[PDB]
Amino acid sequence: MKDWQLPSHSGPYELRIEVQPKSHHRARYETEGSRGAVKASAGGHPIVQLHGYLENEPLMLQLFIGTADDRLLRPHAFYQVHRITGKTVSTTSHEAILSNTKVLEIPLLPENSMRAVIDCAGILKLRNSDIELRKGETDIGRKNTRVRLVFRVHVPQPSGRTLSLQVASNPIECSQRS
DNA sequence: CGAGGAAAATTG
DNA sequence: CAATTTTCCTCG
Numbered sequence: 001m002k003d004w005q006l007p008s009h010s011g012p013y014e015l016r017i018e019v020q021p022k023s024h025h026r027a028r029y030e031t032e033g034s035r036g037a038v039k040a041s042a043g044g045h046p047i048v049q050l051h052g053y054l055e056n057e058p059l060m061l062q063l064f065i066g067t068a069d070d071r072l073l074r075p076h077a078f079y080q081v082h083r084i085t086g087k088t089v090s091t092t093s094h095e096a097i098l099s100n101t102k103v104l105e106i107p108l109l110p111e112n113s114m115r116a117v118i119d120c121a122g123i124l125k126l127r128n129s130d131i132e133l134r135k136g137e138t139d140i141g142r143k144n145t146r147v148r149l150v151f152r153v154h155v156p157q158p159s160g161r162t163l164s165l166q167v168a169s170n171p172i173e174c175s176q177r178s
Numbered sequence: 179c180g181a182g183g184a185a186a187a188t189t190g
Numbered sequence: 191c192a193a194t195t196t197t198c199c200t201c202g
Contacts (some may be wrong), residue, residue, distance in 0.1 A: 029197065
């Protein structure tokens with residue numbers, strides 16, 4: 001259900017998420033698109049801050065979404081939707097649709113305290129029945145209503161070594177019945 | 179306003 | 191048949 005006790009670290013640098021949301025996101029449907037977005041049982045929007053690269057060179061962070069499978073990940077289902085609310089502090093946020101995969105290329109400014117708060121992305125539920133007739137693909141069919149987040153950064157050091165990171169956020173789950 | 183809970187439909 | 195889902199409803 002959660003594995004936050006076994007980090008890999010990146011030398012003298014460390015890219016980790018600050019305030020973490022709950023694993024019970026509320027993804028609505030394309031037929032009832034109205035509510036459902038970035039929130040938690042009470043209050044705890046997700047935050048992403050890098051504490052390591054302290055050079056005058058800029059950096060670009062990318063997001064990699066992958067369903068909550070067992071060992072090898074699968075091609076993301078369809079958790080792709082926009083948002084709307086003055087509280088949508090889009091200081092650092094971006095999206096990138098891929099062949100059955102969703103990614104977010106969020107760049108980091110130079111001296112902006114390396115801040116990247118997440119409060120401008122909602123969540124849509126993937127109608128399993130619609131993904132059942134999909135055939136071939138192994139996206140959210142009918143027994144997998146859970147996806148996983150994988151944050152990855154890539155900052156090349158001007159000397160002889162690349163600084164790449166890979167974090168894993170909690171799996172998004174809309175089904176309430178175990 | 180959002181979210182959760184419950185209800186329900188359909189599919190396997 | 192039960193599994194699982196689906197969408198709604200109600201509620202905070």
